[PDB]
Structures are given as structure tokens and as C-alpha cells.
Amino acid sequence: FQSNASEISITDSWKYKAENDERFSSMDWNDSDWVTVDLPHTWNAGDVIDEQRGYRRGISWYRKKLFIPSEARDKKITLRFDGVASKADVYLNGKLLKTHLGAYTAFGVDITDICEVGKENLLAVKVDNSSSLGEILPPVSGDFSIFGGIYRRVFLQWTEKVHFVTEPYAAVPVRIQTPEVSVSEASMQIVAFLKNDFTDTKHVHVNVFLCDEMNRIVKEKQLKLKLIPGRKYPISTSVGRIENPHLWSPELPYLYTVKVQVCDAKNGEMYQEVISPVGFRWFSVDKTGFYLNGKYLKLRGAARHQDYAGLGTAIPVEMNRRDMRLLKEMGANFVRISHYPQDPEIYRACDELGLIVWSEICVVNEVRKNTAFAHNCKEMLKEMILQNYNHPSVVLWGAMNELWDYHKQAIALARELEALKKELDPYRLSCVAFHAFTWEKPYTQSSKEMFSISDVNGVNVYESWYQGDSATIAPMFDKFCSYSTAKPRFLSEFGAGSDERIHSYTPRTFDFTPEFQLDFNRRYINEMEKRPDYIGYSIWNLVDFQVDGRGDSKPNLNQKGMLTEDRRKKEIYYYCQARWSDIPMIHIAGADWTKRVEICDDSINVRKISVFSNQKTVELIHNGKSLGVREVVNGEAVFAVPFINGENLLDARSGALSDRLKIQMKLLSSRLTDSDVLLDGLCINLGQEHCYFIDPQLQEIWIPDKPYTKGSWGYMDGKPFNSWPGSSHDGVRYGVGADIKNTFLEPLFQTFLIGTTCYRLDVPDGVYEIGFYFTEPFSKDERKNIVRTGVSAEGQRVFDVSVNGEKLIDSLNLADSYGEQTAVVKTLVVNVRNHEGLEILLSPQKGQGVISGLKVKKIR
Amino acid sequence: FQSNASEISITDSWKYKAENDERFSSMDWNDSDWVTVDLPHTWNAGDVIDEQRGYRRGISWYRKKLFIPSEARDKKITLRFDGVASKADVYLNGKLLKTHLGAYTAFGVDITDICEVGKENLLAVKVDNSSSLGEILPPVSGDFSIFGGIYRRVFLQWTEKVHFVTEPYAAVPVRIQTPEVSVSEASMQIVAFLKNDFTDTKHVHVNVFLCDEMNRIVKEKQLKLKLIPGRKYPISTSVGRIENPHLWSPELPYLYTVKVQVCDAKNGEMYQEVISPVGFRWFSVDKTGFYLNGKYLKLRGAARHQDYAGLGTAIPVEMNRRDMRLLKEMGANFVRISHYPQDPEIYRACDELGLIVWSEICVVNEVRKNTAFAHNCKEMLKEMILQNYNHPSVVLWGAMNELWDYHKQAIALARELEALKKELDPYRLSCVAFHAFTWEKPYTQSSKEMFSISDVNGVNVYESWYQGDSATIAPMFDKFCSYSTAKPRFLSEFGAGSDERIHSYTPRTFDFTPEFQLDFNRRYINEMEKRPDYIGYSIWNLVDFQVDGRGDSKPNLNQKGMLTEDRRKKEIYYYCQARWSDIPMIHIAGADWTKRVEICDDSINVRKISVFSNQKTVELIHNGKSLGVREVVNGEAVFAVPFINGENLLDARSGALSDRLKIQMKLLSSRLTDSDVLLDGLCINLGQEHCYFIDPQLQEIWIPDKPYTKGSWGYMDGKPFNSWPGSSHDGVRYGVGADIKNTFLEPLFQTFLIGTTCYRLDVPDGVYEIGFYFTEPFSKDERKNIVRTGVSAEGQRVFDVSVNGEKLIDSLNLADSYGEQTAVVKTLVVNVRNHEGLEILLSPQKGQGVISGLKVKKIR
Ligand code: NA
Ligand code: NA
């Protein structure tokens, strides 16, 4: 059997404890009653998406009784770690073997003469995660937590004693560049390092075959040299004999095999045999576009985060190719590995499937004027490059992102990062990402020095979202080129958050409907495809991802994703597919909005509905009557659908293609005369006057509020809340951003009427379960803003609730009785006689009243 | 204002602790460090679906600072408890007020004398869950779990002191019967008691109205009577001929409304007004069928359990109507409320939608020979009936389900419970359900009285599932009439478990595919639709429900539902819709199977596919080509669909109806160098030779296993496990049934190869990851059987995995190094050189080996 085994996984049956005692490195310690976890693992997989603010930053320990197979006797035994969050202290049989810094790169551990091969050993890992590490290790801050743990795999490796120097940086056994390649003939110059950890000397043959994708050999190149024991000998060959090469592209992803056999001269033994995929391509950059192999190429894609729903970042490794395949089939050709490098699998995926890669490290938000800090940033960039190097998919090396002070050590550290990128990797480009707050540094600063470092400049534009409107967005793309005027631009991040529960026919900023997310990404794609100088752009983000602290619709989540945290495709995903993929498609938008309840007194509820597509034309049939053929423009065709009570079958057609979508639509008359709905429950989203919220647990649709008209329902006084004084949001963001405790229905409780003293519904006689949904929406410190929060001089809010003349909640104070921003529900049973219907009163004692929702059920 | 409140919820912000200290009732206790919950609350929502066998049966305490609005001052004030699992012990202001036995019925506590309107009061509930209670109170045992907590709502309510007596069973305030009902006229009898709790004497009119659905008074009648304090005055009036009443059916569930007021004849002040809906119907039973309102009605339905996924039985109250709507929309007219009485709103839902109700109390599995057990059943029969007295939907009252020993005191209690049903309410029918294990008591008792007590005899048949097969189904229904000779019969349970992840073209018993659950019910329907002496039949169950202990494909869940545990529809919910619902429909089987990957070398892969429908004909169009119009026989038309590789589109059409369903198929060659599975990874469910398994988290598809042929893969040795000694499953069921700790992929692990020693896989060259998925499949008790288990006579199983000569796992003891029935995943990186492919040896040092899974990925 000429085939050999190289590593065995060791991710199984570990003992974990959240406590910090230096005794836990002891062979002879008693870990019996520690929890038993399998790897990957992270102690913040739940900590972050909790209702408690903040997650535990600290130290924990992992112990493993680690056996070593006998086939690794007499060999050089190593331990590879693909990913440990922040600092790691690997102890073996009591004795500290290595320490590592950096949460995102792999690292090695030589255990050869320390371990007993055959017997059994104790492997102890102190894993640190503290906030304190920020004064010496990036990332320093940012919009992404760091789940602590050992969250990528761990393996036990062994090779022969004549071996390849990979340390201190877990670099790839042998680097391979392509210095000059074009449509004619190819060049490949390999770099490596053999070392003889034997007792004697050995004299080698070092063979280098380059085999087809069909593995028919195209070249040979055999060398020989003398390795004396302990000498670290440098190899640096080069071949250029390669005829009529098959070139790698994001469309045609052709990879080559470059075998390397190191074999004993007088003996015939094979000591090593690296094999590594390689790609032939070429590219460059300027304000005239991005070019690859000659032709023109616009880079189109997104950034990916390395976490999954409720798993922390201890993802199954198969996840990594699954995330990237969902990007490729979205129609992209580019991915932005941010804000940190990721699993070997990510990179392997993007050059087997074809995806140009942008790869940063986590110098995020700020630098620390600190001797030590800068050193680790370069030690980490040194690891990113040499660990992922023969990967043709990769094109740009990043390191900085969204700084807020390009100070002195900053700009110097900026230069040192570039010098060492093209030093290490001369045949790849470099990149950086600024934010787009031009009222802050580096735009308020003395100079413009920094925009003239890296080969491409990225910008993070969120106009129409965090501030600015529909109109300020092309002006924002403009004045960036004011600065990055030497080198070409790139759209780093852009995206709006969305929730598959909030829908609106008139979407506005920061209501989190997939509707607004659609218009956002359709204004941005139009501005970006027109300008070729911006060589590319990236959606932020491919995924929804979990960051502890973040609020809004799904609290402790970033919702700008194109996939949910569990990788279900949102409808923005299909829109992009229609503007990018060459693989024919059609899709009726609204698959996430299949049940609808809407006030309408006519027979017909006409509502626009759009069909995303690749083709030139789309036909749409409503209930069997075609609505006409229409041309697809910017991926989209918008029909006007005459919706009617009951089932609505919309079937879209265009050529050989199809999509179907059944929309259940319940027309509700404004007079409560004509409605079965009260027997089910009339659920009213108080303070929300332009969105429908659907709770997927009950399928309850929370219809929007309206002012009271005679014979119907609504409020009498009061206004829905939307004051954000001093932002683009004032009068546009309805409701607060708070996470609300004891409810999942955030879009319901966050919306509220303020100052409403009276609510009417004109219902028929009978018994009613009225249920009220309250929360104090404001924190103790924002309640110090007495006008905006409608509270008393001392910040209190006591009011009473009366129904039909009876005081029934006698002094409701939400904050001091239930906690601020905690959900409070009270149900009442009221018998309505005469034809009085329901008159609800909120009598303020201190401050002004608040209600988030109402539910009206006729129970008999 | 003539309107008034009655009740107000007190389910918000409670204090909770799982300790038992009697001081916990004291007003001044410091519950400051206790956790806050809102009701509905259980405390086994987690317990029941975790890995630890069992759940926590014990005592916990609730505390709530109870505020009493002044609107209720010097009125009669009651606490309302809709449900509290087993024993409650309610204290107010330190003083114990009520103790209550029984999880499933409501009780009431009077606080008018003890409470304090305007002060804070302290309301302590001690709640109790111990099996220790099963000796004095049912249920004793049974396929479900008693989720301790206060899991239904709780109300504080107030009346005026002249009030309808409700205690001791918290009955409906006026009882209502219809002794005579026909198309031309109906009679009506109302029953109530009155009490005066003032100091004065009061003279009161009683005003009885009977209003139609438009609330037009169709009958009225007043009664004069005077009430000296404290005396319990009965009343019982009749209402004369009602004339041409609108009857109640599951088709037309017309509902009237008995309005009963009690006013003061001297001034006119109104003391009470009680609104009570009713319907007019009449029914009977014989061996020729069920008759409702004069016509023959085949009763077709399903039972419903109380719980919802991850919420235990602390469901929100609206879920109750959501379930009943889903059920009516499956074509049911019948619901089996079992094994316990359920929420008030299940019964309000059922008689508004149109579903006839069989309603049981919870005397399951055995009757206890104690004087106190029997008494508590009587009092739980009283509580059920008196609380659900007026619901037109209830037609049958139950008490016992599946006894296993009809001993003397059992028959004595079947008798007093029928004697009691007819006493308290003579106008409804009576029912009971038996098991179908003819080899056990009571089918082997000398006597047969137990089969002659209550008016209808149900039977729970699982032939073809727990025992038997296709040949024994109909012979069983006949045997049940051998015993049910006087009273008619009913099919109260029948079902088969299904998993949405396991799919088979050749379904067999206990593989948990929906395609066997399909055939099962087909065979069952067809028999009932021709057996008129089975007046009706109810599927088991409407929902997957949560029960600790049960394992199989999804552990801790009873998987026999029409809907998933979160109320999503399975394939078979649509099959019932074909056979029952009178709403025209069409639907292609396989919406749970759109990703398929099969071994097939020709370009076309013919597979059979069903289309469910109401209609006489379906035409099916695959990829634009029509496959013809097939007649719909007994709900379905199967076709032979010629699947190609790639996207396949299926159009089913019937006049105006149509369903559409795309199916993605990956064809896989036998020879491994013909495709690219290896580059994502070949996932092979070893031990499973007829079901595919879609891991919904990675969307990977564990294909079945085939013995080895050359050029491809498969096992050289051994055999997949399927040994069930003495059972009908013997050879039929592959795998074991135990919960496999540490995974959610129980269909992958529970199946496995046994006694295999060699495994081949003729893959190209390159570097491979190979995962190994293991488990000790049997327990210590189960390994006492050396022969079925394949272990050493001391009970042990040790072996070494080796690949391509080299030994890597050094000697594995599964149940000793990691625990029995835990999941372990090893991963080698091995370098296939030359043309060796992959040899995998399992070498046993004790017993025979086992192995569940294989992933084979080509990484470079
Ligand atoms: Na609201
Ligand atoms: Na298996």
C-alpha cells in the first residue's frame, strides 16, 4: 500500500469548564464532573442571543485524554488547530508547549519528544476571550461578537523526519506563484523548506510533477541536494515550460495539480508528497474597471459571516461550502471574507466553484498606539497570507476596515501592512475599507494621505439606512472619489436590515420590511452598474448573523442578510439572482407574505406585485385571467393585481419557465357589522400605521392602526410614536429599537401610541376578551429626555385603564412594577349591551399613556 | 353605560421556585431572588425533550402580588383557574383556601371574604406533579407526560352578590338541555340555582330569552321568586314549542343564544345576565351507523393533544382554535378530545366551525383498587360534564382508554361512570376505547360485561405497525365485533409514525417514511368506508406530540400526526383532504422530498409518484410533456415519472385546479470518477438499504447502502442490522430505536452494519477526508443477548479501524470510552496513491464491530 495516512481528527469527547485555575493543566487533576463537549465548541453560542445584555468575556479550559496511534511512532508528531477564539495555551502532559494569539488563523504545535506514542496523554488548552486582550490584539471593537471557544476543528498530524518547514506560521508546505501567465504559455516558481530531523544525513530527490485536471502529466522537474541534520535548507526553484494553458476564471474554474515528491536517492523511500490545487490567471486594476485574463469584469457579490443559527461559530465544517454555493447560485462571482480570515474550506470552495475572493484581517474600527498591538497585526497578516496562498480564487489582501482616526501609528501601520503583502505575495492585489461617514476622520483630518496606500479602496455606504435618504446616495458615491482619487474604488458594504414578518405596501426607512430592503438594493445596484470605475461591489450581508447587544426587529441579530440565520433564502436573494445569474430564472416576490388581512370595502384590493426575472418579458396570470405581458426592466416587472377575498393564484410565466404563488387574502370591512373576524380575534398593531406584522406561531396577522371613524375602530387622540430628533429618522422610524423582554413579537411591542387617551371600536353586543399589550419602551436614561418620552419631571408614567366607565387597572406604572422594556399583557372580559360597543380610556396620572397593541375576541 | 366587566387576567409576572417550604405561603416572605414567569407556564418544557431520561415530577411554588380593582369593592370575588397540572393548594394572604386534585379541569376559589380591595394581597399556589399522586388520581400511566405548572390561564372575576351557584364543580352558571328536537319543533329546559349573599331579602325577576344568530328574540319568559339570604334556591323552567328550529350540524353549525337575566323586581337593578350559546340537534347509534338530525352521518376525524413544540403544554390559548381550524380544513367532522378534557376554547371553536366532539377524562391503562381513586374519577367526570354542558358539539362522554385488567373494581367503575354520565346529562351518548391486543386482558377474561356498558365501543388498532402486516388488518376489525356484540363500534385510534427526513420508494413497517404512513392509512380508510357498523373512525393523532421516553427517528416525540409539532402539514394531511374534504383540490405527493440523489447510470430514472385529489381525473405534465389523464381511484392517481438529471417540473391539473412541484434530482454513476460528489462528500447511510435521509441542516443526502461491486463502493462483509426476535418486525425493521445522545441525526446512527470487516471504495487518486459515524447501538440489558448483539460473552465490543494497511483507531470500546448509544465521529485524512482506492478494515478484538455512517470527501 503506497498510500499513507497523514492526520486523525481529535474533536471528540473533551472536558470543559468555565473557570480559570492554573491547576487544570495537570495530568493528575480530577475533571470527572466537567461537562463533555464535542468540537467545535464555543461558550457563547447562547450567551449572545439571550435576553440578558452583554456576554461573558473570560477564560475556560479544555482537557482531552489524547491517544497517539502506533503508526506515528518514530515520526514527527504535530497538532494542528484551525481556529481558537483569541488567546490559546496548549499544555501537554503538564508542560506548556505553545501560546497563540489571534482568533481567526490556524496554528501548529510540535509534541514529538513530549508525548508518549502508544500510551495516552493529557491535552489541556486554556482558551481566553477577555475584553482586556484588545490593548494588544485585534479586533479592538466592532459589529460582531467573539464567541470564545475552540470553534474550528483540531487534528493530530504526523510526517516523516525529513519534512517541510511550516512554522512558526502554519504556512502551506510549499508556496507556488505564477509570475508571468497569459493566453500563450505559463510560468510557475515554487518555494519551500526541507529539514532533516533525523540523526544521520540524507540525500534527496525532490520531484515536481504538474498534472492535468484529468491528471495527465504536463511537466516534470527533478532536483537533488544534501540535507545535513538540523539544517533548515531553502529551496527556490522555477519552471516556465507550460504550453497553451487552461486558465482559471469565476466562470470556467480550471485548477491544476502540482505534486511534489521528496524521495531518498540511494533508497527509493518517499519522505513527503505535497499536492496542492493551483490556478492560472492574471488581473489588474484602475479607474477603467477590473480586468481578469484580458477581458472586462465587474466584481459582483457579498460578505459572509462564519456563524449559523444558535450555534455560535462552532459550525459544522460542511457549512462553509454550503454558504459559498448559495452565493455562487445567487449569481455572484465574488465573496468578501470579512472581517477576518475563515476556514480552509471557504477558500477550497471558491476556486472549485469559481469565486474571486477578497480576504481581510480584523484591524477594525481603530488602532492602539501601542508597541505590542502593531506587532500582532503583522504576525496575523503573515499568517493569513502564507496559510492561504496557492489559492487562485484569492485576489485582494485586506487588513483595515472602517477606522475612525487615521492617526500617526495608524498611517505607519497602514504602510507596513502593504509592504509585507507584496513582499510575501507579489502577484496579488491589496485593499482597504473606509467607512462613509464623511463628517468624521479620516475625512475631517489634516490630510488625505491614507487614501493613497492600498491598490483598491473600499467604502461602507449606508445612506437611506442609518442616515441620509433616497437622494443622498449617488452624492455619497461621488464625494468618496473626491478622496480615493488616485486608485479605483469598491463598494465594501451595503445593505438594509429586514424581517420576514413585517410587510408594507409603502416601505420606508427602518421599518425592516423585505419591501424596503428590495428598493434599497435596487437603488444601489443601479448606481453601481453604471459606474465602471468602482470595479466591484459587495452586499452586506450574505447572511443574518448574531451580535449581542444589537436591537431592532430581531434583537441580538444583524438583519441585512440575504439569508436567514438558518440559510433560508429571503426574497432579496431572488432579486439579486435576477440581476446577476446567467442561469434563467423567474420569481414572484411575496413568497414570505402568503397570508394577508387588510381593510377594504370594495370587492377588489388592488396592490402592486413584482416579478423578478432574467428573461426579456414576463406574463403574470391572476386567478386564470392573464394580466398581460410586460418587459423585465432592472430584473423587475411590476403588475397591478386585483386581489379578492379568499385564495388568489398568481402564476408567473416567461418562456420555458414558471413560478407559482398562492396568496390567501381576507378583505375586512371597516364596519364591524360585516365580519366573522371578531370570533377569531381582531389583532391591532397600535402605533404602526403602514406595516402588517404576522406572528408565524399563531399565523395571527396584526393589522395596522387607523384613526377612529364612525361605525369603525381607531384611536381618538394621540399619535403613533416616531420622534428621533436630530436624525434622518425623525418622523420616519415608527417605534423604538429596544429589545423587549418576555416576547418574541418585537415589531408589535416596539410600536406604540403615545398620548392616546381614548380608543373606540363599535362592536355588537356580546362577551369580549379584550387583551392589552403594554411596555414601557424607554430606558431610564432616555427618559431623562422628558418631552420625547412624555414622562413626568422625575421620569414616571402612571396611568389608568377604564373600559365602558369602569376603572379596571387602577394605577399602571410599567417601569417600576414590571421593568422597563419588558412585555406586559392584560386581558379583560367585558359584556357589551345597548349598542355601546367598547370605549377604552387611558387616564394619565403621571406622564402620558402608552399602548402597543389590542386584541378583540368575541367569545359568546 | 349598561356594560360591565366580569373578569381580569392575573397571568402576568409571577414568582417561581422549585423548592417546597411551607413558609412559602407567608405574605412577608422574601421572594426577591425568585425568577419571574408569565402564565401559561409549565416547568417541563425542557425536561421532556432533553437527553436525560425522564422529567422532573415534584412540587414548585408560585407567588403573585394580587391587586384588586375598586370597581369590585364589596362584590363577590372569585379566582378562576382554567388548568393547573395535578395538585394545587391555593393560599391568599397566608390562609389556605382551596386544594384541588386533577390536572385537566378548571376549579374556582372564593376570596370575597379574605381578600382586600385596594391593598396588595399575596396569592400563593403550591403546584404538584409527583407520580406519588397517581395512586389516588388518574392518569396512572399512559403514553404522555404530565407537564407540571400553571399551564392554562387564570382569572380574577367578580359578580354581584345575587349570583348563580357555580361551586363545587365550577359548572356553567345555567345548564341547558333539549329533551325533544325535530325538524318542526324543539323543547328546551334550563337548570340553575340562585343564591343571595346580601344582608337583605331580595325579590328578583328571571328573564329567559332565546335569540337566533341575528339576536332576534325568538322566545321569552319571566319568573318571579324571592330569595332570603344564604339559601340555595333551585330553578328549572321549560320553554314551549320553538317551531322550525335551525338545526346544528358540522355542515351548518347554526348557534342560538340563551340570554338569562336576574333583575330586582322592586327597583329594576340587574344582578346577572348570563349569555349561553346552544344548538338544536338530535342523534342516535346502532350497528347501521351514526344518525344526526335524521340523516346517516359517517363520523371522520382525529384526536388532538395539548402541547406545542418547545412550549410543553403551556400553549397560548389561541393555538386551541388554530388546531381545530386546521382539522376542519382537512375534511373532518369529528374530533377526539383525549386523553383528557381540554381548554374551554377547544369547545367554543368546535361548535362554531362544525366538529362533533368525543370528550374523555383520563382513566388510562388501569383502574386502582382504592376507595379514593374511584371517588376522584367520579368528581372529574362531574367537573368535565358540568363545565362543558352546553356545547352543541359534544355528543360522546368518555372515561376509560385501553385498560389492561378489567378486574372486579374496574367493572364496578365502568358501571358507576356510565350510571353517572346518564344521571348528570341523559341526552348525550357514552363511549369507551379498548386496545386491540387480543392476547391480553380484557380479551382473555372469562366475562364480557366490559363490552356492554357505554353506548359505543372504540378500539385502537395498530396492526401493520406495532405487530402484524397487510394480511391482519381486516381480520382484526372483525374480531372486535366478536366482542362488541351489543353496542356498536368505533375506530378511536389508528396511526403510523413518519419522519419528514426519511423517504423510501419501497416502504416497509417502522421505517418511519411518510410513504408507509401513506399506505397504512389508505388500507385503513378503505376498510372503514365499507364497514357501516363502525359508525365513525378517528386518526391518531392530529399532531406530533411531545412525550418523554419514546424514541425512534425523532426522539421524545410521538410521530403519528397529520401535522408536525409546530402545525406544519405533512404529505398525509393532504391524503385525508382527498378522501374527506368536500372542497375540490389537487396535490402532488412529495413536497417534503424535493432534493433527491440516486445511483443511476442511464440518463432517465423512472419512479412512481402519487397525486391526491377529490376529482374524477388528474392529468400530470412532467417537464412540459403530458404523461396522460389517469382516473382517480380512492384519492390518488400514480404515474411513472421519467426523472432526468437536474430540475424536473410536475404540473398536475383537474379542470380548474392545479398543483405544481419542482424536484431537483442528482443522478449518480456507480463509477466514482464519473462525477463530483467526492468534492462535497459522498454521505453513505451504512445499514440502510432502502431509505434516503436528508440532513436538513446541511441539505446533505445520506444515500442507502449496496454491497460492493467493482469500480464503485459498498460493504464486503457482514449485514445491516434488522434482528427483532419474536416480533413482526424481524428482518423488516433496520436499526435500533434508542435515543442516540450527541446528535440529531438519529436516522443515520440507529441504522448500522454489523460484523462487517472490509469495505471498498474505488475512488480516483487524491487526498481524502473520511468521517466515521459510530455508536454502541444496544444497552447493557440489550447486550446480555450475545447473539443478537454480536458482543463478547462478558458483554463487550472492541475493534480497530484500519485503512490502506495503516491502523488509526487503535482499539475502540464504544459503550465504555464514550457511553452506550452516544454519537462518535472520527475523521481521517488519508492519501490515496497509485490506484489503490480505499480499503477500510474493521478488525475485532472482542465481539463484532458496528458502524453507522461514512462520509468520503476529496479535499485535494
Ligand atoms: Na403595536
Ligand atoms: Na447507518
Residue numbers in the entry:
A (entry chain D), B (entry chain A): 20 to 879
From the paper:
Bacterial β-glucuronidase (GUS) proteins comprise one class of gut microbial enzymes that have been shown to reverse Phase II glucuronidation and, in doing so, cause the GI toxicity of several drugs. In an attempt to gain insight into the structural and functional diversity of GUS enzymes, we recently reported an atlas of 279 unique GUS enzymes identified from the stool sample catalogue in the Human Microbiome Project (HMP) that clustered into six structural groups based on their active site loops, Loop 1 (L1), Mini Loop 1 (mL1), Loop 2 (L2), Mini Loop 2 (mL2), Mini Loop 1,2 (mL1,2), and No Loop (NL)20.
To further advance our understanding of GUS structure and function we also determined the crystal structure of NL BdGUS. Like the L1 GUS structures, BdGUS shares a similar core fold with EcGUS, with 3.1 Å root-mean-square deviation (rmsd) over 528 Cα positions. Unlike the L1 GUS enzymes, BdGUS is a dimer and possesses two additional domains at its C-terminus. Sequence analysis revealed that first C-terminal domain of BdGUS is a “domain of unknown function” (DUF). The tertiary and quaternary structure in BdGUS is highly similar to that exhibited by BuGUS, with a 2.3 Å root-mean-square deviation over 816 Cα positions. While BdGUS does not possess a loop at the active site, as predicted by sequence analysis, it does contain a loop insert in the CBM that enters the active site and is not present in BuGUS. BdGUS and BuGUS share highly similar tertiary and quaternary structures, but the catalytic efficiency of BdGUS was nearly 10-fold less than that of BuGUS. Finally, despite its lack of an active site loop, the NL BdGUS was found to be weakly inhibited at pH 7.5 by UNC10201652, with a predicted IC50 value of >25 µM. However, the CBM loop in BdGUS may enter into the BdGUS active site and provide stabilizing contacts, enabling slight inhibition.
